[model samples]
Target: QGSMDALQLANSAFAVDLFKQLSEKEPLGNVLFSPIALSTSLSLAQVGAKGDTANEIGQVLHFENVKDVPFGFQTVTSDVNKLSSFYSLKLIKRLYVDKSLNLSTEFISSTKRPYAKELETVDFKDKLEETKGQINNSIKDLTDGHFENILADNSVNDQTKILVVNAAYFVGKWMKKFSESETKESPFRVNKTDTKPVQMMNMEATFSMGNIDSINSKIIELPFQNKHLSMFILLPKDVEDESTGLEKIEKQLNSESLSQWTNPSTMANAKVKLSIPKFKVEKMIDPKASLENLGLKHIFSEDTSDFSGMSETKGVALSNVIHKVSLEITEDGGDSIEVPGARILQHKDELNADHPFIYIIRHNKTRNIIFFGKFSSP
Candidate 1:
């Protein structure tokens, strides 16, 4: 019962932590990646890590706070993957170990039991190209050929021991779909002076909305048809305070603020003139440095690392953590798109998301964030 509460808190904290880390590195870019996917990948690695190595992994990944860390991570990944039944959501993880080494029985079983089942012992020692093809092709097959060529030519070498690969794809429909014909060319504010043309979809519906005065932003919830998931957008009220609108919000985001902004009870139902720019993003991220920045130094370092739980053979360390995530939102999924303007609402609030904003798609039941990113520009 309390297990999920731990996971939700830990997951949300890490999600905000990672986002802030990326924002600090280069604050202006389309940042998108699955938090659970990265955590699950690291959690699987943590299962095999021992001694200080394990502790560092847990601390950096925010697993040490969890009561049942292993069980909790496995269940969360499984639960998120189960959402594929409701929407086009799929998360695939694969671990490629060198053929020279061997994995223990317990390590193999742990990865399979509610964890990633795709494990391959490839010949990374001599046949780097062959291993790359196998890994890339397997990723394509895993995501129905939507993603491929994840590894670069020089990304692998003769001394590479272990590699982690994760792929996520999602396509969700709105509970009240937006009409395609209602979409028109709109300008998306890239910065104070720059504006890019975007196809803005219009919809007028009564939704739960509120504001976060801490960041001076308006928050709105767009529930998906699944009822289990909803998309939350945080749009800054004025561009004059752009510094506080996006940067401050990113710096101040946490579990408490996220809950306060998205809580349906606190938000009043109002007729919102929702105009969101239709956006599609396919971005691949290499989270090695970010993980290192988050105090995960032992796992990536050769001298201080330990993975005896995985194999009795010594000198096994993590090489790279690569993630590929994609999302596409359109009116094509909604067959019945209509406006319910029958209610007698007091005032109609306008939510024109023309400027840079933060978006989060969360699971309503679990309170776990599925996907969240910044659609700053085209």
Candidate 2:
């Protein structure tokens, strides 16, 4: 449990840092990714790392003190898999090694023992297309066909030795379903001046809500059924206030702040008139540049990096880190409610997300972030 807490802390911090870097590098529409999957992939690679190589990876992952990486992942995967019957929570990690390379027995045992994952060897040199198809099909199966095209053109070639891939997909029904009839076409503010019409879902329910005077945002907790996980929505106090909205929150975000803002004790249960948009995002992040920008400089370098434990031969290093994540936010799911009889008592507070905001889906017990994103336009 202590090790898992450290991992969650590392994941939350990395999620915020990655968001900041992505916003600066791309500065595009919506941003989303699963930090748990990303960190798990890197930790798998760390299994074969040694000396400074292992230390660099540990520092980057904020796991310098946590000795066993696979044990931590094993615990996480076990807990998440427990909620499979309740929600769609799936995370698959794969290591596609070149057929010629000889993977050490220690490395193989570590992966299977701690992560319950196996290293798959494919002939990337002689059978590139076949290898690609096999990997893509596996990912498609893991994601329930949500992502069919994970490997693009030239993602793998004859020279490529290994590809570390992590694919995750989640679809959780709301504990209290929003009426499809109450959902209507509404204007979503892209910015202070730009607006777009989106299908906004409405609901009136009791939620844990609080105002953070420091960041000038209201935080609300929307739990999924069975209370396995919950989505924490952070909205700026004034929808039109561009200066102190998501940008401010992003800048001030860290492990402690995220913990403080999302803590249940800091919020109170109240009747809220909730309005959220039906949004979905499919994102493929290389994460190499972002990791490099975060001061993980040695692992990417073939000459300086040391992955002796991974392979018996020399010159084996990290080839590529590919992460594919898909998220769907809607009011329709397995949960059923009689909307006709539902009533909102007087003097309820309004927590409408008609504008840009940030939402995080976190595991309830571990407090690990499963998904994090910003909804600006859609």
Candidate 3:
């Protein structure tokens, strides 16, 4: 029960490693994948915390009646005597409910109940969809939860439609402002000869940045709260100039390369330049794809998705996974001049995004890449 904190930390760290692995496995080439990286990192952090719910079974159930045990927590506390047999039986059970099998995902919305019982591996999709309103009401009465239900209704049965929802959402904002005035439609070189008119935001600020091996790849680090969390943007010097730079980066991305640059006194003392599009895109992936790719094949395989630790009767299988995201670019301060009764400043004319880039949001203490994504045009 108490070790849950460590498990929470471990889950976050796994997500960061997952990002590096994905990058090295596939070369995104000249396309910008910042959006995808950012979205994926955020999704992992949100999902990881929820997956730990099963560990809190005991404290959560007795929270209401027990004054000294701590409230709002559910933990399954088996004494040293029962720990062995309890877990032995648990190892033989299933934690996840398969999508193909008739099951309800409504159980996810709330914590498991008291007396330690088995979930009857029955399809509860009908229960899930039917009680959407009730779940919404339950959530509204609880903590400051950030969640959205994203699922398509399948007319399989009256009670067996399941859904995979991201229950927690945490996002950080730009410390500086991006003035809409700095945005302009510029020629974006997505590919060699393929150019498109794109709206870009320009910023000339004292940047906290660093470079990779060559001038082609650089890392720009920005802070949110002193240093607890920050945003790291990796920009390829040439937009579509060449493809070799990314190859070198992929080769260097292990634990050592991940820490190429630490907290620098000042990323850049001089005024740095930035130009990027303020576009938004949302996407979802079957968690199965990501899990399988991570070498956790046994967990997501149809024959053996062994999540026996989560429940007794449910026998888990990944039914589905849904993800959503958004991104924007803007500018900060420059200069101001006063005239008569009004004050005006010379505004920057352009936001030049001449290179492809990728970005990551990380929690420093936990070393968790809570959010990461990349963006490029082809």
Candidate 4:
């Protein structure tokens, strides 16, 4: 996190940037870089072996009333107060969108027809065909396969009438590089006593760093060549021993320390280790919970929402919002090759980011991963 003053400046800049890029009149969504928001969201994302929160403040997205089909992964509620200045929902939404786009595209080529947009007419077969087209168009728009593809089912008659779209596209890589040759066997203690040798990738790299001594956690910043892009990797000194070491990190993340450091500087490429895992999580969201936290009490209250932008008549409001993520780590850096169904490529062991950790990717400023799970043998 940057100093409080820097954070405020950055937040103000981000808010303006978002305002300029985001559709103000149109009922559309966008993906922008929000270092503070990204940092906060990712921190929560890696809080445990598996974590879930319906109204976690930082993870929440509040929205004002609009009778529209507002859908996106990890969106903020409209309530401004509930919004975490440290995070930008727009960026998180992009990540989810990227995953959704991919799922849609792969599914489309095989599923015959899988539409991903809210349909105007109710025709199952036509909707399916439209889904494929929408997915293709979205992929083309994002350039890279950053967005995932999925079709929402809102048919009451069970005939598969209309489809809602959720696809995102993100294109960024690690700012710091880990060596494949240095990757070797190391004992990765999953818990206090369950120790097993896991291949941990090590790297000595330059980075922008920050630390909170109270929590024994440090933020090692890595930047992409673009400067606007970077990744924050938070390493917890005591997480691998079955401890969710976050309360400490959160307790000390204040305006003072955050403002003090935001520039690239000295970083030791220590004998860093890893046992990064591959996992896909599918989450079912309670629309009510999502709305309550995002400052959308009016919209959810059935009394104060104005969704006229989506349609003239105000009859429908968001019923539910579902988000899922599938992150995989292989030996090779993210590369693609040809196979049968959805092609797969192999590589030498790439970046092993297996421990309980959060990843932050920012556009134009140094990012922070406030916390990364630790591993040790006692």
Give the Cα RMSD of candidate 4.
Answer: 15.2
Question: Each prediction's Cα lDDT score?
Answer: 0.78, 0.78, 0.40, 0.32
- Clashing residue pairs in candidate 1 are none
Give the residue spans of candidate 2 off by over 4 A: 239-244, 333-347
Alpha-carbon TM-score of each model against the true structure: 0.93, 0.93, 0.58, 0.47
Write model 1 residue lDDT over 181-275, tens digit each, in one string.
Answer: 89999888877767889999898877778877878889998888857778888898866554424876776787677767777788876788989
Ranking of predictions according to lDDT: 1, 2, 3, 4
- Tally clashes: model 2: 0
User: How much is 305 displaced in model 4, in angstroms?
Assistant: 2.7
Candidate 1 CA-lDDT value: 0.78
On residues 1-378, what C-alpha lDDT tens digit does candidate 4 reach at each position? Answer: 323323334333333322222222111221122323332322222211011221232223211121121211112222211222322212222111111111223322321221122112222343445544564455444323434443344412223211222222232334344446767776654444444566665653323454545566555555443343454555455553333333344344433443333334534322222344322222222233423533334333223433332222332323223332222222333222223322122221223443344343434322322111122221
Deviation from native of the Cα of residue 105 in model 4, angstroms: 32
TM-score of 2: 0.93
Candidate 3 lDDT, 98-180, residue by residue in tens:
33353324333322341122222333454554454544443332213322333334412343322333322233445554577
Instruction: Return the number of clashes found in candidate 4.
Output: 58
Off by over 4 Å in 4: 1-149, 152-166, 169-172, 185-190, 194-199, 240-242, 250-288, 300-304, 319-355, 365-378
Badly placed stretches (over 4 Å) of model 3 are 1-13, 20-128, 131-149, 153-164, 167-172, 224-229, 240-247, 261-268, 301-303, 329-352, 364-367
Clashes of each: 0, 0, 48, 58
